[PDB]
Amino acid sequence: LSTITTHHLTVPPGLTPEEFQELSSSIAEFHSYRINPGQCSSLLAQRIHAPVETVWTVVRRFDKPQTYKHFIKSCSVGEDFRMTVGSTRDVTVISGLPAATSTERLDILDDDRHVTGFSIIGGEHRLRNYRSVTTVHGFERDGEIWTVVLESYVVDVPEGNTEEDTRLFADTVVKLNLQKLASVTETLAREAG
Amino acid sequence: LSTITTHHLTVPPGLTPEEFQELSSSIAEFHSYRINPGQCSSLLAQRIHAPVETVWTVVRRFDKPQTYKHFIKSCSVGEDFRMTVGSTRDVTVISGLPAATSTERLDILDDDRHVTGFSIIGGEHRLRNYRSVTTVHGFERDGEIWTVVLESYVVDVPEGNTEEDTRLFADTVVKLNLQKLASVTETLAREAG
Ligand SMILES: O=C(O)/C=C/c1ccc(O)c(O)c1
Ligand SMILES: O=C(O)/C=C/c1ccc(O)c(O)c1
Hints:
Two copies of one chain form a homodimer.
Chain A: E1 3-4, H1 17-30, E2 34-35, E3 39-48, H2 52-59, E4 72-76, E5 88-93, E6 102-110, E7 115-122, E8 131-141, E9 144-156, H3 163-191
Antiparallel strand pairs in A: 1-2, 3-9, 4-5, 5-6, 6-7, 7-8, 8-9
The structure holds caffeic acid (2 copies).
One caffeic acid (DHC) is lined by residues 69, 71, 91, 93, 95, 102, 104, 120, 125-127 of chain B.
């Protein structure tokens, strides 16, 4: 039947053991899921040479995912949008197929603890019933400062797909978007303002 | 009926007018196509802070596209592969769909002029009858050296797609792969060896 993910028990790629030891409690709290047959789940990590709040200022902008994600043709939130849990956005993904819309709901937004997350609630693409959580974490050593971003998801494996089929695709997309996040926020950090 | 592409008559994004003026003859020679209704074509450019031959050493490796492209699960050329025009490779693309194979043929390989190109000759994906050409070009100013990579393609627009549907997708993939090429070759340059 259902099982618990083990992301919080091993070092994900792109994290050092030292970083993992500081983050294991956060991974248990925010990046653990109860999964069912036909679902898969992964945890990805990205080190960023910028302060936490600089990274968080970009991560938290639910209305502007194109600021750090690839393959976004457009994203609309409509008038009267407030940055509050329950809000939705309509994302049009660059897919090489006829353009549709992924409708996504903001599930979590904690500016104190630097946690956000969302669910895909409709849209006809390769990530059915996708739900993800992103957390942002600060590190220091001898006055030097960096950030780690953790992003996990659960998603349905489509009929005819292997788990590897779906997991490798979703991991690749998340990893590439985190690399964009790292580039964008490192530029913001180096330029101050 | 058929028309000629105009890539050689305007500055593509990511190129300066000065760079374009030095490259317009190469764009006419290597990045111009006769296209038909139902096809689209684009030219993309990427500046790289590395010497031409450093970039070319990576660009030319037809057997190892994963060295600079994203979304490659595997690539096989089989025993007795020689780097010669007419050779093929089997590329398995990370697609979130059940894994298949894009069979691709090496169309051009000129180590003197730094031109290569390939065609997708089978594979059941979003880039039917895709053909592309990549050229690598050196620039100098006051002893400083850089490279521009130009990559163009022609591809079929699937039934039900708009030209923008296909062109935005193919452009995004090419642009992201060129960014990876820039990162990989800039690292090779900075480390020498
Ligand atoms: O390629 C697909 O099949 C879907 C990709 C996708 C779907 C929803 C998003 O928010 C997003 O950034 C990417
Ligand atoms: O996403 C698709 O539909 C196909 C992508 C694709 C197809 C062939 C390649 O060589 C490649 O790098 C990517």
